[PDB]
Enzyme design. Structure first.
Site, PDB file in Angstrom:
ATOM      1  N   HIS A  66      -8.450  -5.575  -2.511  1.00 41.84           N
ATOM      2  CA  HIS A  66      -7.179  -5.414  -1.827  1.00 41.84           C
ATOM      3  C   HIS A  66      -6.535  -6.769  -1.612  1.00 41.84           C
ATOM      4  O   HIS A  66      -6.442  -7.249  -0.487  1.00 41.84           O
ATOM      5  CB  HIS A  66      -7.377  -4.710  -0.491  1.00 41.84           C
ATOM      6  CG  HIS A  66      -7.758  -3.269  -0.619  1.00 41.84           C
ATOM      7  ND1 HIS A  66      -9.013  -2.860  -1.019  1.00 41.84           N
ATOM      8  CD2 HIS A  66      -7.062  -2.137  -0.352  1.00 41.84           C
ATOM      9  CE1 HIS A  66      -9.061  -1.540  -1.027  1.00 41.84           C
ATOM     10  NE2 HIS A  66      -7.892  -1.078  -0.620  1.00 41.84           N
TER      11      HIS A  66
ATOM     12  N   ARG B  30       3.348   6.849  -4.873  1.00 42.09           N
ATOM     13  CA  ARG B  30       2.674   6.342  -6.056  1.00 42.09           C
ATOM     14  C   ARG B  30       3.093   7.112  -7.301  1.00 42.09           C
ATOM     15  O   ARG B  30       3.191   6.533  -8.381  1.00 42.09           O
ATOM     16  CB  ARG B  30       1.166   6.381  -5.853  1.00 42.09           C
ATOM     17  CG  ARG B  30       0.756   5.590  -4.624  1.00 42.09           C
ATOM     18  CD  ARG B  30      -0.553   4.856  -4.807  1.00 42.09           C
ATOM     19  NE  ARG B  30      -0.554   3.590  -4.071  1.00 42.09           N
ATOM     20  CZ  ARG B  30      -1.088   3.398  -2.868  1.00 42.09           C
ATOM     21  NH1 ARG B  30      -1.690   4.388  -2.223  1.00 42.09           N
ATOM     22  NH2 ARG B  30      -1.022   2.194  -2.311  1.00 42.09           N
TER      23      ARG B  30
ATOM     24  N   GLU C 177     -13.644  -3.097  -3.592  1.00 41.26           N
ATOM     25  CA  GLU C 177     -14.437  -3.973  -2.724  1.00 41.26           C
ATOM     26  C   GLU C 177     -14.792  -3.326  -1.392  1.00 41.26           C
ATOM     27  O   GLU C 177     -15.435  -3.962  -0.554  1.00 41.26           O
ATOM     28  CB  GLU C 177     -13.696  -5.305  -2.490  1.00 41.26           C
ATOM     29  CG  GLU C 177     -12.905  -5.485  -1.170  1.00 41.26           C
ATOM     30  CD  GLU C 177     -11.519  -4.876  -1.216  1.00 41.26           C
ATOM     31  OE1 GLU C 177     -10.608  -5.415  -0.546  1.00 41.26           O
ATOM     32  OE2 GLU C 177     -11.332  -3.860  -1.918  1.00 41.26           O
TER      33      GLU C 177
HETATM   34  C1  LIG Z   1      -4.046  -5.583 -15.784  1.00 39.50           C
HETATM   35  C2  LIG Z   1      -3.555  -5.488 -14.340  1.00 39.50           C
HETATM   36  C3  LIG Z   1      -3.109  -4.084 -13.969  1.00 39.50           C
HETATM   37  C4  LIG Z   1      -3.816  -3.546 -12.744  1.00 39.50           C
HETATM   38  C5  LIG Z   1      -3.160  -2.313 -12.188  1.00 39.50           C
HETATM   39  C6  LIG Z   1      -3.700  -1.931 -10.841  1.00 39.50           C
HETATM   40  C7  LIG Z   1      -2.984  -0.747 -10.241  1.00 39.50           C
HETATM   41  C8  LIG Z   1      -3.670  -0.225  -9.005  1.00 39.50           C
HETATM   42  C9  LIG Z   1      -2.992   0.984  -8.416  1.00 39.50           C
HETATM   43  C10 LIG Z   1      -3.648   1.435  -7.134  1.00 39.50           C
HETATM   44  C11 LIG Z   1      -3.183   2.805  -6.652  1.00 39.50           C
HETATM   45  C12 LIG Z   1      -3.838   3.327  -5.349  1.00 39.50           C
HETATM   46  C13 LIG Z   1      -4.920   2.429  -4.674  1.00 39.50           C
HETATM   47  C14 LIG Z   1      -4.611   2.096  -3.220  1.00 39.50           C
HETATM   48  C15 LIG Z   1      -5.400   2.919  -2.209  1.00 39.50           C
HETATM   49  C16 LIG Z   1      -6.138   2.057  -1.139  1.00 39.50           C
HETATM   50  O1  LIG Z   1      -7.126   1.401  -1.587  1.00 39.50           O
HETATM   51  O2  LIG Z   1      -5.671   2.085   0.034  1.00 39.50           O
END
Ligand SMILES: CCCCCCCCCCCCCCCC(=O)O
Length: 248
Positions: free
Chosen positions: A79, A117, A153
């Site tokens: 995060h 999202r 993590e």
């Molecule tokens: C090559 C880099 C691209 C990486 C893309 C990462 C996109 C991550 C999207 C996360 C969506 C939901 C997760 C958040 C939930 C939480 O942990 O509170």
């Protein structure tokens, strides 16, 4: 949680007692925390095409080569920075991808987050209450040579993998390792941070999955996560408790 908590966590990162965490660091971390939420507000309305064009990912070719090999890929990240922005970048530069999200309470709030999202172009599967188990669906994505993204993590439940993290015990989710073992998919650590008024994003070399040990792999993930966070300490907004000792 809170910012008192955030101080206790940064304390581990820099190897100092909570009282001695540099004021400048706490400010930047708090500023960073605020920035995430400030960006989340307007993100759905931004020009996603432009952002995809103007933001970069360091060593993105790591991911591309795993996808050229038909293996699928697991993107595991902490995060830090703005992971939602990274998600938009991937939708624009690769295409829709799948992830999962905790089913918060109230239900009105969970749906709100899903809508949010979904408006960014992600597929978000519920950890609970969905038609099927989430980590079966993820595996199908990987087996179709597609990427999934997991925040990796934190998982302070019975099922979280016990790992050392900045020299102290925490628990992290087992999902990234399980899927990689099951599918043969490449397990790439990722880091996001704030680089001035913009956003930093990086893909790191895939993790060695030879042992087939979910514990050794997840621990190796943490070791990297820890290194990057030590590099970008201000961009890791963990206000909730992280290490076990800070719990009830
Ligand atoms: C090559 C880099 C691209 C990486 C893309 C990462 C996109 C991550 C999207 C996360 C969506 C939901 C997760 C958040 C939930 C939480 O942990 O509170």
């Amino acid at each position: 949680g809170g910012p008192e908590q955030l101080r206790r966590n940064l304390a581990r990162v820099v190897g100092k007692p909570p009282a001695d965490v540099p004021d400048d660091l706490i400010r930047a971390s708090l500023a960073s925390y605020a920035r995430y939420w400030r960006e989340a507000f307007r993100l759905p309305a931004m020009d996603h095409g432009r952002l995809g064009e103007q933001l970069d990912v360091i060593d993105i070719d790591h991911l591309w080569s795993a996808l050229d090999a038909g293996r699928g890929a697991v993107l595991a990240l902490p995060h830090s920075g703005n992971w939602d922005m990274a998600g938009v970048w991937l939708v624009q530069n690769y295409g829709p991808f799948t992830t999962v999200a905790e089913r918060l309470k109230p239900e009105s709030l969970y749906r709100r987050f899903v809508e949010y999202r979904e408006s960014l172009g992600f597929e978000v599967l519920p950890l609970t209450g969905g038609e099927r188990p989430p980590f079966e669906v993820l595996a199908e994505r990987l087996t179709d040579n597609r990427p999934i993204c997991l925040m990796a993590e934190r998982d302070l439940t019975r099922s979280g993998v016990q790992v050392d993290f900045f020299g102290e015990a925490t628990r992290m989710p087992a999902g990234p390792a399980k899927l990689a073992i099951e599918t043969g998919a490449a397990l790439f650590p990722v880091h996001c941070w704030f680089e001035g008024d913009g956003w930093g994003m990086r893909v790191y070399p895939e993790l060695d999955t030879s042992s087939g040990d979910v514990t050794a792999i997840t621990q190796a993930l943490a070791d990297r996560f820890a290194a990057n966070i030590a590099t970008y300490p201000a961009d890791w907004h963990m206000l909730q408790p992280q290490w076990i000792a800070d719990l009830s």
